[PDB]
Amino acid sequence: KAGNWLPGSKTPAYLEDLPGSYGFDPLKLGEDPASLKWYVQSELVHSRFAMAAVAGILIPEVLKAFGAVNLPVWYEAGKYAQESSPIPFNTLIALEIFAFNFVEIKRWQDFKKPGSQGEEGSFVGLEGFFKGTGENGYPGGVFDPLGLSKGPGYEAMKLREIKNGRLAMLAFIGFASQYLATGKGPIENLLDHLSNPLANNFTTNGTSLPAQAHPLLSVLKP
């Protein structure tokens, strides 16, 4: 186990060997093993989506703060890309539906029957791409072109993926909540916090602590 999320608590035995495990399941969602396998895949998929999304938000924002690029902010990039997009909105949705239906059905079929997308005659001659590794959530093949899963740092890279994945998931939800609460981008929120941490935080954004539910805010003030 990587550790204990709550020192002194009794950690569940079914999480003892999973990568990235801190024994954290107070709601007992993963007590059933089939549920646990499904949730391991779901956590990895959420982690990788959030990882790529937080990269595609933070790196343009960091390079914009450094004066390098001037790409649009993340919550308005849909509008600016759509006007210049040669493909209209409805066609983009239909294409995304088709492509993700295909790839997610292939991933789902591999989850139910491991290695079944790599068998002979499975794909149209290209089935060697998708042989799998016998590990839930770690496909390999085309998805591991450099073959770094065969190296000796593979187990530590699994742990690195999950913890960075959880951090990225929290970060994207923070991006969305910060936009909804302040109306500014994430780097501007960080700079405002760095300028005055006591006064520039969630307790003063006027949304996170609703005024009706917290009457002492309008009272205990200068």
């Binding site: 190296g151 000796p152 740092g153 530590a156």
Partner: protein, 193 residues
């Protein structure tokens, strides 16, 4: 045994096998043997590029050799800035895949691809090759290299931070500190914002 802190406990995985082994690992970073081998190679690589960088920064007449090193990219050459980046990327890609393949399987990249008679001698270490990389038989010397590499790494970091806060060249920083050291140093300069 020499150590960075005489009189303290030494980690059990650092027994002087490696050069420059003074038991310095307060954060216990490289514990598993794959990590320690990778960080050995990375220390060698970063230290050698930092030795070259410290030399090339301290060495710099001529209009080009009067420019700051952090403003050096704005000098005009025979190619646009994009072209040299990709050419350097290509040459580095070739030599780095050679060095990486040596790092994975030792002795795998020892033979000249176009000359079958020209081959690096066997028993080659990953970070310590032989043959045409050692034209003289100069090979105690690894402690010297790792010490100069670490000093150059700290020097290059000092170049980067000094050009970031004061906005000054390294020679200007040394001359400012040599004017009055008790007022022109990291204290006072940063305390004057």
């Amino acid at each position: 045994r020499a150590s960075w802190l005489p009189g303290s406990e030494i980690p059990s995985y650092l027994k002087g096998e490696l050069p420059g082994d003074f038991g310095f690992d307060p954060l216990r970073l490289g514990e598993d043997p794959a990590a320690l081998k990778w960080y050995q190679q990375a220390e060698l690589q970063n230290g050698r590029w930092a030795m070259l960088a410290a030399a090339g920064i301290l060495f710099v007449g001529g209009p080009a050799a009067a420019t700051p090193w952090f403003k050096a990219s704005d000098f005009t050459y025979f190619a646009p800035t994009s072209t040299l980046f990709i050419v350097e990327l290509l040459l580095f890609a070739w030599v780095e895949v050679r060095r990486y393949q040596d790092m994975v399987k030792p002795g795998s990249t020892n033979q000249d691809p176009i000359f079958s008679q020209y081959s690096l001698p066997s028993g080659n270490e990953p970070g310590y090759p032989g043959g045409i990389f050692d034209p003289l038989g100069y090979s105690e010397l690894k402690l010297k290299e790792i010490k100069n590499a670490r000093l150059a790494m700290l020097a290059v970091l000092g170049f980067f931070v000094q050009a970031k806060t004061t906005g000054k060249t390294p020679l200007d920083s040394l001359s400012s500190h040599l004017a009055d050291p008790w007022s022109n140093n990291v204290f006072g300069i940063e305390h004057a914002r």
